């Protein structure tokens, strides 16, 4: 019955809020729909693969919120393996490289990739953070899709490409079915493009020793009984002196304040007394989340590597199920793996075959890739749709179409009398991340916490200082890459 | 607890399926979540208007299904009024017009209007109304809004902005919203461009004398104690034998089948054990309402109708709240008013201002368009804004956002094991109309029957008899408006004879 807080959603942004509440001495208690904590997270561990991750994994600089939560937690981090060179295979055959971006050679191509990377960057300074719908152009680029900015953009096909894997990847999304505006705010609020597509120096950089799940299941465990599973949360009642909250199994919770921290859209499965204003009652329907599912093709060795390749592959073609891999083996370099991406329409497309079916294209795939037969005998397979979870709705996050942002956007972290708003969706940096997730928590958190007289206004927001075991290095770009000119540029010239 | 099977929804499509289960001898549950019937229709009775239709309203020739089922209720219609001349307002000023289109002068403009509607009524004949996604440009076009569609057809500023308002208009929401694929399906499924905007031979031809809202209300009449309102469903359950169904109040409820009769996204409300096909799952948050509010102003007198105007103001510019209007008039001639809409994004900006402000500015509107100061003395004032509805989502209906019709649209009146979807946006002729509902809601009914052998597969789609009452005359083209090229056409032209 009786507590100070509600939270609705056992996630990363559900459990840091809820830890900082108790932490603060509050009463708090966390209902969840699932028989599980951790949401889009989740770590299986069988003997195959000793432990894997099979939602959210990647971590690194710039993202020291998550960072310093799992090291209070007793948590370790290892890099990804990007020590030999990458591959990017483009129509049937396999280029490696080394560095970020895949290198381009034909000069005019070279200047449509350069300036495509650049103007992403130009467009995402005009676009603030906090408030992505008070960009000088925002209705514009809010009514227009990713296709359509990049049909105007790149003036080759290869740019163009290379532009559309890089958005289905970011984003698990067609280029057609996104805002312009949003996209762009999406990689700013990351720390833009090299940022959000590296893995030494970016996004990519680490995972955690034994699995990101030990987040979500560490914090219950400092939680104790305050933690409720399989109570789906179906009724929210704020008519009352005290907010009360029904679960599908009819209990009953009663709190001064709720944190709702799902998935905006989820919102939608429960019912609330009185009604949601009406900007909030139509957003929610407003807003889906992408389509991806992750597989994990185990090897007896990573074998990639004596031919001085990495294990990153970046595919090319409509052919391919999957556009993105990483090497997934362990750092004391046993359990070897490939882990790979099906996105966006191939989601939805593969997803009929069956879980053979997917491993053979995958390895007959790998193989072609990487120029080995050895990729043709794997030992072990485990794969996740995403699409298919009632309590996610899809990963990696929630994408807006064209005309939403500007029109509904202010509206994601508007409270709603009593209930405050979590969940990655509603942070300012790095939303979509696991970091996101602690950003929206703690901060919904001590929204509560103002709200009751306990803190100033003043500290709703806070600052992280930088983790001391993953220090950023600073983006730079070179005289050339932003004094070369466009390719209508070049032709304006001429 | 026990039944035959239970109805989610008591709007029309659910009203209707279960009225013909009952007359078909099963034992049915309609389990409604408001305290009304009717839905997305909503008939307001006070002394000051009598009568007053809150939300879906009108009906016209093609509309059989509807008209059946309203006249068998004991219902009549009438007309509404285009006696007089339609007024098309464009950059501050009025010219009133006969016909349904609004007349073009300058002939490069003619020709952009004449393409425009043209190639939308071409675009359509491309697409089955039962399947769009299987259109032979399917993916091409759903992958397309219809502002770019917009931009690469009107090579007039004039055409594009009318094709814009026709947008506004159809289905509540921006250009930039919507699916290309998708709004041509929904034009097309209507019977065209022609169909779809007219009032005479028309979808707005008529109303319903007393409101549509007792289409709802007498069936539930007919069916007594077995409408359960205040019960919003909150929980199906599908791994015993029988269908579980639960709701919010905590009552249990126990079929062989269910029919969802809510609009797609509203069954995002509902629990589901086991859950549902991940198509499903994931189609549910991809499909969005629209935003409208309608606003009804009283007058002492249809005081338009002495200047030889019928009440019809097509209204263009951002600056207009209300960018269509019809005469409200009862047949009577008592009870003067004018409907008007305010649409998309417009219905969520002026929705901060008070009643009295969005009046006020409706008034001044309408004198101005009408040129008349008796337009500033409204007499009375209703109006509903059915974005703040958590049962409806929005009005008038369901709009497909770019790439998901093609995606997730075959999944729309795809059974799940023993649930059946009605609701009018599974229909496929009149989709988003109370017609539809009535098609959809039938039509899973009968796949019912069929699922329990009483009827031939044959038999669950079925044909509908021309109404006696509603004589629809044929949709016709001239000679000219045929074969007069389009803009780019005439450049070509001209570029052929300078060689
Ligand atoms: C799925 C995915 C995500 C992902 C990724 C790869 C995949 C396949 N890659 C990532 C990467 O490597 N690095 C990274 O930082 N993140 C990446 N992600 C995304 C990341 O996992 C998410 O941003 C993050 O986990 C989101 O956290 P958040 O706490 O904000 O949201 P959640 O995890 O979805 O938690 C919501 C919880 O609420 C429960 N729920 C839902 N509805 C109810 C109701 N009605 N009542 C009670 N509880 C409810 C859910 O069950 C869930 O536990
Ligand atoms: C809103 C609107 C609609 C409209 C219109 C103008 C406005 C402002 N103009 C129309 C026109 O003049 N001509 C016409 O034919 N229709 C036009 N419309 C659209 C029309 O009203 C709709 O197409 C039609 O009414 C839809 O009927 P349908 O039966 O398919 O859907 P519904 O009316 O929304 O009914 C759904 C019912 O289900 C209940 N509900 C929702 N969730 C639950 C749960 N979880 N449990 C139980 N019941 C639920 C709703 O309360 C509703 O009654
Ligand atoms: C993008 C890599 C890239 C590099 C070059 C060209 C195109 C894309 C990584 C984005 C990512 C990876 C994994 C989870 C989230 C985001
Ligand atoms: C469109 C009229 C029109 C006529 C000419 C130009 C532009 C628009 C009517 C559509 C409509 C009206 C009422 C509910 C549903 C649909």
Redesign the interface.
């Known amino acids: 019955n009786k507590c100070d807080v509600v939270v609705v959603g056992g996630g990363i942004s559900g459990m840091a809020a809820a830890k900082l509440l108790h932490d603060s001495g509050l009463n708090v208690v966390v209902l969840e729909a699932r028989d599980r904590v951790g949401g889009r997270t989740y770590t299986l561990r069988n003997q195959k693969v000793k432990y894997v991750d099979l939602g959210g994994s990647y971590v690194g600089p710039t993202q020291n919120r998550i960072l310093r939560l799992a090291k209070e937690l007793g948590l370790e981090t290892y890099k990804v393996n990007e020590v030999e060179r990458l591959i990017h295979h483009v129509k049937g055959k396999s280029y490696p490289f080394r560095g970020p971006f895949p290198p381009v050679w034909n000069p005019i191509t070279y200047l449509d990739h350069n300036n495509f990377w650049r103007t992403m960057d130009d467009m995402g300074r005009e676009i603030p953070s906090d408030a992505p719908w008070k960009a000088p152009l925002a209705e514009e680029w809010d009514?227009?899709?990713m296709?359509?900015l990049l049909d105007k953009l790149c003036w080759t096909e290869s740019a163009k490409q290379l532009a559309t894997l890089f958005v289905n990847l970011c984003v698990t999304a067609?280029t057609?079915?996104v805002s312009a505006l949003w996209f762009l705010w999406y990689v700013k609020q990351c720390g833009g493009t090299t940022r959000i597509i590296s893995t030494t120096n970016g996004g990519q950089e680490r995972k955690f020793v034994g699995g990101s799940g030990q987040v979500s299941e560490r914090i219950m465990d400092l939680l104790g009984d305050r933690v409720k599973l399989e109570r789906?949360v179906?009724?929210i009642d704020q008519t009352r002196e005290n907010v009360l909250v029904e679960t599908?199994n009819?209990e009953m919770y009663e709190a001064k304040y709720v944190i709702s921290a799902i998935p905006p859209?989820?919102g939608?499965?429960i019912?609330?007394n009185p009604?949601?204003?009406?900007?909030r009652?139509?957003m929610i329907?407003?807003?889906?989340?992408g389509?991806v599912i992750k597989c994990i093709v185990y090897y007896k060795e990573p074998f990639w590597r004596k031919k001085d390749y990495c294990g990153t592959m970046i595919i090319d073609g409509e052919e391919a199920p999957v556009a993105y891999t990483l090497d997934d083996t362990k750092p004391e370099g046993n359990y070897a793996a490939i882990m790979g991406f099906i996105l966006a329409?191939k989601a939805?497309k593969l997803?009929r075959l069956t879980k053979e079916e997917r491993l053979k294209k995958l390895c007959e795939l790998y193989a072609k890739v990487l120029g080995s037969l050895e990729a043709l005998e794997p030992v072990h397979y485990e794969e996740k749709?995403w699409?298919?979870?009632?309590y996610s709705?899809?990963c990696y996050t929630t994408y807006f179409?064209?005309?939403?942002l500007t029109?509904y956007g202010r509206v994601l972290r508007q409270p709603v009398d009593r209930i405050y708003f979590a969940g990655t969706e509603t942070a300012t940096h790095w939303s979509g991340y696991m970091e996101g997730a602690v950003e929206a928590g703690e901060r919904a958190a001590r929204e509560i916490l103002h709200a009751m007289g306990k803190i100033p206004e003043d500290e709703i927001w806070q600052s992280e200082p930088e983790s001391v075991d993953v220090p950023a290095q600073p983006i730079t770009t070179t005289f050339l890459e932003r004094h070369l000119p466009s390719v209508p540029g070049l032709l304006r010239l001429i």
């Open positions: 009514n227009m899709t296709k359509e067609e057609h079915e789906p179906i009724y599908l009819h859209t989820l939608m499965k019912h609330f009604p949601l204003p009406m900007m009652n139509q329907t407003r807003v889906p989340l389509s329409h939805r997803a749709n699409c298919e979870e009632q709705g899809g179409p064209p005309g939403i029109q």
